Amino acid sequence: DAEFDEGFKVPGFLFKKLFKYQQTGVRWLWELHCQQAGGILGDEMGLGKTIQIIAFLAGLSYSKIRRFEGLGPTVIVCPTTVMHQWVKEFHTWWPPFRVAILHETGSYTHKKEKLIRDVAHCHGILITSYSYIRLMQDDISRYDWHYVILDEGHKIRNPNAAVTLACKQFRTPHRIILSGSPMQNNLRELWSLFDFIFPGKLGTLPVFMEQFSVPITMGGYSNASPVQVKTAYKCACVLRDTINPYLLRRMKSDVKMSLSLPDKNEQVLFCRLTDEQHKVYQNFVDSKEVYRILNGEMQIFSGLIALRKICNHPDLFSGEEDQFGYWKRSGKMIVVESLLKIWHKQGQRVLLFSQSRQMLDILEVFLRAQKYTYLKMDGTTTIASRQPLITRYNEDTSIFVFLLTTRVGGLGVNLTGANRVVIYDPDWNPSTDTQARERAWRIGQKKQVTVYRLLTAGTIEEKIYHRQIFKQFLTNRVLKDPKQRRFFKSNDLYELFTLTSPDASQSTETSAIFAGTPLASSSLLAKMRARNHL
């Protein structure tokens, strides 16, 4: 059996099964357990983070380290769609853990409070949903939990949500987060996650923002004064080394040689607005509503929703060959016509993504107007019948296009039989579109998958994509390397109520922006003066 420095006898017949990065992760988790601190397994999806957690907890139970003779009661807060998976994983790796699910489905068939009491009384392994943490936040937190594992802990990304407060009402030193991305939009989410795992390490959120978030974003613009970018680099370095020993994040660059990965290509099509759609958009951006938005007298949010609706299709905003949702009145639907026809002639299989469920229904009606066989899964479908549809799409070839919104289903529902994917409209979060493209291109994908993002040039959608890239750049700067070539302008990025459609004489805004493509008190002093000159 493998043995660590202080003595943590992870069993040989489990430890041998792990991969090198998995064993490194178990080492890191147990270093945290010795320091009595929490962490974030920020390894991206597909590497396997549940295996690391069960291996580490099993070693902690067999090693009988101690308070508690070995491992005590632990709570795992995960989305419903994976709860049963978790128990099966335990039951196949380490059987003697009395694992139990808290759910209406469940297995207890009695009062749930009795389940919490009984499981804690046996030092069991208890799995919940985030909603049960929120609802029983006073009840579930009375039985001296030894570990808290927030699987997909990006549910805590908001420092305001009641789930965040209910999850931060736990008392143990041991807080582990299993999230594919600690931050998705901005540094609010990084702060919230670190406030969970380690209450004191990063400062109070005001302090954190005023020190890190504002300088970094101010240095994320290409029109920033040199002092601003240098301060942003320094502050990013400080945040990086502050979070270094508590965020274990591994990419698919170092671990790529261990597992295969088919090549992925991606294009961003810029779909010109149709003349009627262009007229409607120009009338809205000239109407008094956007003027009141610019005055601040009305919520800008409704104008955003309206312009997104216009760029999707005029029939959304406005409300034979003239029925609801005719595909000839929006240029993005023209390109979807061309791509769907060509891909059907190629015999491939398509994922059709869109943030709007109404335009998802419009796309359904369009597909019915054509003769493409298809299958739909969205939020309106019952969850108990979600797994069949996916399976029926993945097993046969007699279904051509599968319809999604970016945010339906559990994280990473296995849509492997698809070959091509089209994202009909961009979202504000880079992570939801990254998840959309990732869902088709996962482990065990047989053929080269390509993603086509559909944009309308010079419109709100182009600015949504620009914001998405900007947030992705911020996340990358924080998480992998601070030095980064600056792409954007502060005013152009934030002003998003104009219409400059290209005439093909001049290039599009995106291509114009992307036009180029003990210490001995002297090392200590050298590092201090180095950081200070920046």
Binding site: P159, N160, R188, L205, P206, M209, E210, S213
Partner: protein, 51 residues
């Protein structure tokens, strides 16, 4: 203390438009700024903004 509905009755006009009392409009402002202050203290806000 927010008073009951009797102290600030919502009188219905000739049609269906329910007009609210001055107290109700003021309480709406108070709840708006109270929630706004609650989030600004809970999430990122400058000291002068909270002030």
């Amino acid at each position: 203390p927010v008073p009951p509905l009797s102290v600030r009755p919502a009188v219905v006009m000739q049609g269906s438009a329910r007009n609210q009392d001055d107290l109700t409009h003021k309480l709406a402002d108070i709840v708006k700024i109270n929630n706004q202050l609650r989030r600004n203290e809970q999430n990122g806000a400058a000291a002068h903004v909270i002030a």
